[PDB]
C-alpha cells in the first residue's frame, strides 16, 4: 500500500470534523495535520486556493491527488465507503439533513465568532428565532426516518454531519437542545453507540474552541 491520506486544517473541528469522523468510522488511518495560527501564513501560499481543509490522497499507484471543499471531500469519501445512501430515497434524506444542518452550522458559527461581549444577545435571538425553526426541521427530518439514523439503518454522512452540527449547538447554546429538542439530544447520545471507532475517537480527541 503506497496508500496514504493526509488532512490539512487548523487546530479546530469546524469544517474538517465531518471528514475526520467519516475516515474514523470507515476505519481509514490518516495523518491528521492540524497546524497553528502562527504556521498558517507560510503554509497558505503553497496550497491550492490558499484555504483548508485539504485532503491529500496518495493512491495505490503512488500518485497524489489533492482535494478541496470540506463537504465535496466528505461526499466523495462517503460514496466510496457506501455511506451516501443505498437508494435515491436514502440519498435525498442525507442531502436534506445536510442542507438543513449547513444552515444551522452557519448560525452557531456566527455566535462562536461574536465578541464576548455581544454573544448573549445573539444567543437569545437564536433561541427565539432561527434556532427553533431550523431545529424543528432537523427534528422532523430525523423523526421521519425513525430517530436513530437519517437514512437506512446504518451510519451515513448525514448522521455524522448531524452529529457534528448538534455538538456545535450543545457547546454554543448550552442546555437548549437538551431542553427544547430532546429527540435530537437522544440522537447525539445514541449515535456513537452505532460505531465503536467513533466513540473511542471522541473520547481521545483534543479539545478545541469550535
Ligand atoms: N466552504 C469551505 C470553507 C473553507 C474555509 O472556511 N476555510 C477557512 C478555515 S478557518 C480558511 O482556510 N481560512 C484561511 C484563510 O482563508 O487564509 C469548506 O467547507 O472547505
Ligand atoms: Br463532533
Ligand atoms: Br464538532
Ligand atoms: Br433552554
Automatic annotation (TrEMBL):
Q: What are the protein's UniProt keywords?
A: Transferase
- The UniProt annotation places glutathione binding at 15, 40, 44, 51-52, 70
Record text on subunit structure and interactions: Homodimer.
Tell me which InterPro entries the record gives: Glutathione-S-Trfase_C-like, Glutathione-S-Trfase_C_sf, Glutathione_S-Trfase, Glutathione_S-Trfase_N, GST_C, GST_superfamily, Thioredoxin-like_sf
Name this protein carries in UniProt: Glutathione transferase sigma class
State its Enzyme Commission number(s): 2.5.1.18
Please state every residue range assigned to the domain named GST C-terminal. 87-210
Instruction: Give the record's family classification.
Output: Belongs to the GST superfamily. Mu family.
A Gene Ontology molecular function term for this protein is:
glutathione transferase activity
Q: Which organism is it from?
A: Fasciola hepatica (Liver fluke)
| Metal-binding keyword on record | no
- The GST N-terminal domain sits at 3-85
Task: Recall the taxonomic lineage recorded for the source organism.
Answer: Eukaryota, Metazoa, Spiralia, Lophotrochozoa, Platyhelminthes
Gene Ontology biological process terms from the UniProt entry: glutathione metabolic process
